[PDB]
Amino acid sequence: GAMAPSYRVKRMDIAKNDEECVVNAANPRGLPGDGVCKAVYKKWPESFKNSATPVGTAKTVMCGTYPVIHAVGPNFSNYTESEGDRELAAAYREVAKEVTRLGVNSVAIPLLSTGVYSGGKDRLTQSLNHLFTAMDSTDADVVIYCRDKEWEKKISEAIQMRT
Numbered sequence: 001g002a003m004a005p006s007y008r009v010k011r012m013d014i015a016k017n018d019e020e021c022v023v024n025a026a027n028p029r030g031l032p033g034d035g036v037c038k039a040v041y042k043k044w045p046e047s048f049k050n051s052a053t054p055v056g057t058a059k060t061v062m063c064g065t066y067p068v069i070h071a072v073g074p075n076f077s078n079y080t081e082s083e084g085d086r087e088l089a090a091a092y093r094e095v096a097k098e099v100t101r102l103g104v105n106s107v108a109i110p111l112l113s114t115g116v117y118s119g120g121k122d123r124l125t126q127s128l129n130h131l132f133t134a135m136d137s138t139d140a141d142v143v144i145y146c147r148d149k150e151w152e153k154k155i156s157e158a159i160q161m162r163t
């Protein structure tokens, strides 16, 4: 575990992370995809061998010894708000199980279902709160990655608010 488990936020490409493992915002088919998934495929393409997994689940594949946790959030274009909210909470619970199983002291994690799976809605708070609900019982250092300047400020505020 980390000596004083923390949350932090950085605004940069998650493919450049300084953590012991990465969470991919994956599609259910293990395809290269768009956005975070695209960046992860270019950096760790070996981790896409047999990475397909259903919505609301996470599947870890090693690239060398570096673990890539493929977490499949719902596409809010296809899910109702109710069923999508349940599946988005479930994906983060499965990430916390994998992070614990791997014994890592740190993890890089994007906000699931906030980009092309958002169904055109701002889901920063919804996605971040489900992240916290899952990760708060783990002792890994968590580093959240984002690309927008206003999102960086809002995620940083949400972390600082809890102290």
Ligand SMILES: Cc1n/c(=N\[C@@H]2CCC[C@H]2CO)s[nH]1
Pocket (backbone or CB within 6 Å): 012, 013, 014, 015, 025, 035, 036, 037, 039, 110, 111, 112, 114, 115, 116, 145, 146, 147
């Ligand atoms: C390469 C990179 N993308 C990041 N976040 C995405 C921005 C839009 C949806 C987000 C998650 O898919 S963090 N590092």
Ligand SMILES: [Cl-]
Pocket (backbone or CB within 6 Å): 011, 012, 013, 016
């Ligand atoms: Cl960058």
Ligand SMILES: [Cl-]
Pocket (backbone or CB within 6 Å): 025, 112, 113, 114, 115, 116, 117, 118
């Ligand atoms: Cl997304």
Ligand SMILES: [Cl-]
Pocket (backbone or CB within 6 Å): 146, 147, 148, 151
């Ligand atoms: Cl972002």
